Amino acid sequence: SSIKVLKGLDAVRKRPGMYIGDTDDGTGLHHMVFEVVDNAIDEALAGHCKEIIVTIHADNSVSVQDDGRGIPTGIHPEEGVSAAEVIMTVLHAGVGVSVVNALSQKLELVIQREGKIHRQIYEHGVPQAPLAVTGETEKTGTMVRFWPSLETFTNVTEFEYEILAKRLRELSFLNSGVSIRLRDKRDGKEDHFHY
Numbered sequence: 001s002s003i004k005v006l007k008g009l010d011a012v013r014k015r016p017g018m019y020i021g022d023t024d025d026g027t028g029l030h031h032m033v034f035e036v037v038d039n040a041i042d043e044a045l046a047g048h049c050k051e052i053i054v055t056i057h058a059d060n061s062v063s064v065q066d067d068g069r070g071i072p073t074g075i076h077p078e079e080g081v082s083a084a085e086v087i088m089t090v091l092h093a094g095v096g097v098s099v100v101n102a103l104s105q106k107l108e109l110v111i112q113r114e115g116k117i118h119r120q121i122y123e124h125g126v127p128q129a130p131l132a133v134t135g136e137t138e139k140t141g142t143m144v145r146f147w148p149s150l151e152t153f154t155n156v157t158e159f160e161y162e163i164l165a166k167r168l169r170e171l172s173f174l175n176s177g178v179s180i181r182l183r184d185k186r187d188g189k190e191d192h193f194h195y
């Protein structure tokens with residue numbers, strides 16, 4: 001279990017184009033955002049009047065936040081770690097957010113679910129500690145922030161607002177019930193897509 005997880009993530013770094021697309025022309029880099037957004041849209045669609053927030057941070061990390069159910073935090077018996085950790089680290093649990101985690105120098109997960117805030121940090125897909133309770137909340141949802149690995153992504157390594165805005169406008173149109181916010185903390189640029 002311990003070694004298959006490290007191997008599944010290793011397999012993604014060994015053949016990254018097969019999982020995320022071109023790692024040199026900016027395709028793969030922006031696909032990283034699209035993969036997390038697709039998970040948030042899928043959650044948004046599972047509910048009513050849900051909202052997704054996509055933030056380009058000033059340090060060229062991206063966060064994707066939904067106000068959905070929250071990824072489950074209970075122990076997954078096969079692995080003996082939180083379901084959230086399994087979803088983030090096990091390739092076989094639509095390539096999945098585990099690809100983004102494998103190709104991220106750092107990833108931060110914050111889940112709001114069943115009265116509690118839960119947080120976990122990853123480096124190159126490796127958890128730094130078990131998912132932990134950091135406090136109380138009556139909000140629900142999932143926030144993923146990721147810093148793409150420059151051991152994978154070459155040449156085009158800076159996120160382009162217009163590439164994210166165009167995809168999110170398409171996704172707003174195709175999912176007319178979902179609110180999508182895009183925020184660029186590098187310059188204060190902000191858009192709200194809601195059909």
Ligand SMILES: O=C(O)c1ccc2c(c1)s/c(=N\C(=O)c1cc(Br)c(Br)[nH]1)n2Cc1ccccc1
Nearest residue numbers: 039040043064068069070071072087097142144
């Ligand atoms: O409450 C449940 O039964 C339940 C199940 C799956 C599940 C959720 C809730 S929320 C969720 N995913 C997201 O909300 C999500 C993923 C990412 Br990346 C973002 Br941003 N939001 N799921 C999907 C899922 C979670 C674990 C295992 C399998 C599917």
